Symmetry: C3
Subunit: 155 residues, 3 copies
């Protein structure tokens, strides 16, 4: 203290980065390559484990550029002080399934991914490459008092 | 202090639970049974009232297991220090309305609910039973300074 | 300190408001009039700039009444201590694109907007007027320790 322990669970994992002095969170990288078609849901593995101390919670949340440009929706996960397992990114491709087809996948910048081997995809499908910035981790202090039942509130 | 007051508004309400030492939030239970079809929006009542003190905000947020497994999307509500009313869960069934039908409802674990009385439902419909863990409450300290307008930023 | 600097970037910008003593956040107003059809994504400009000090993060988040009543989904943006640019609201009209038409737009209260000049819109389209409360800003303390890689966690 004040130090957060980080455990890499595979060779695909990458150490989170907080480059600027002013930055609030840590860049979280994907440890796997996954293709998400319209409406598809998944929990993307980071192969990263952290030991958040008591009196804090980690917010594994979306990234500003990715969430604004793409239909990829990350549900902010609340990381407990007592969770030492693999950090998973709760994600949904919120693009509508209009049953149309295209030869182009989309990257996390919403650009068309040009392939030399031509394949057929559902329109609005995204590919997340291994090692890409898709999320960030912001840790905040928490207040956890012992609950007391009342019939009416005082003051 | 440090104690949070909790008020139960009906016999359907349940006292929030923070079982583990390390846990950041309190399990929030539903006080009503509701069936949400695709795209349907609702505010589910908890029949629970809290008196968060000044200098804090309550985050009435989604649950890790429910949000990952089901298309049920909870918008994290910001609970003011001056809100003593019924806590409502802002929820949407984000499952697409593909106009298909099935005889099975889905629980908060995304399992098919087997009924003895056969009924016809829209595909992707969920049922939330009374007294089920659907949300959690995480309270965090806040910073609220008196605003000052500037033409340029200093340092 | 304790004071947050606010910079207005145009005549369309409005000073954020924290009216009640108990309120956790500041009302954020739109600086532009925009019509969002089903599934459409945009970053609405506030023309407001803030200088959050180090050791804090700003949560530019949804509003309780708007998010519950309308299909307008705001992704909570994490505002760094080192961001002095225009605050943008990351928004999506999550209403399904069922290819139906209506003569009525919808306001942020989900009411039909009556026009004297009759126009044809896609069903589930919303209009956000300039100067309307669409979001709020909640600032919270953060914990940013220097990371240390471990092979196993201690205690
Ligand atoms: Ni090849
Ligand atoms: Ni029966
Ligand atoms: Ni959707
Ligand atoms: Ni006119």
């Amino acid at each position: 203290t004040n130090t957060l322990q980080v455990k890499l669970l595979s060779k695909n994992a990458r150490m989170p980065e907080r480059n600027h002095k002013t930055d609030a969170g840590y860049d979280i990288f994907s440890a796997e390559t996954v293709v998400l078609e319209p409406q598809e849901k998944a929990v993307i593995k980071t192969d990263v484990a952290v030991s958040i101390p008591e009196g804090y919670v980690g917010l594994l949340t979306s990234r500003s550029g990715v969430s604004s440009k793409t239909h990829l929706v990350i549900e902010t996960g609340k990381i407990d002080a007592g969770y030492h397992g693999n950090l998973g990114i709760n994600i949904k491709n919120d693009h509508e399934d209009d049953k149309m087809q295209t030869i182009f996948l989309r990257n996390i910048d919403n650009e068309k991914i040009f392939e030399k081997e031509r394949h057929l995809y559902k329109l609005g499908s995204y590919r997340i490459e291994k090692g890409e910035r898709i999320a960030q981790l912001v840790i905040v202090p928490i207040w956890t008092p012992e609950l007391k039942q009342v019939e009416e509130f005082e003051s």
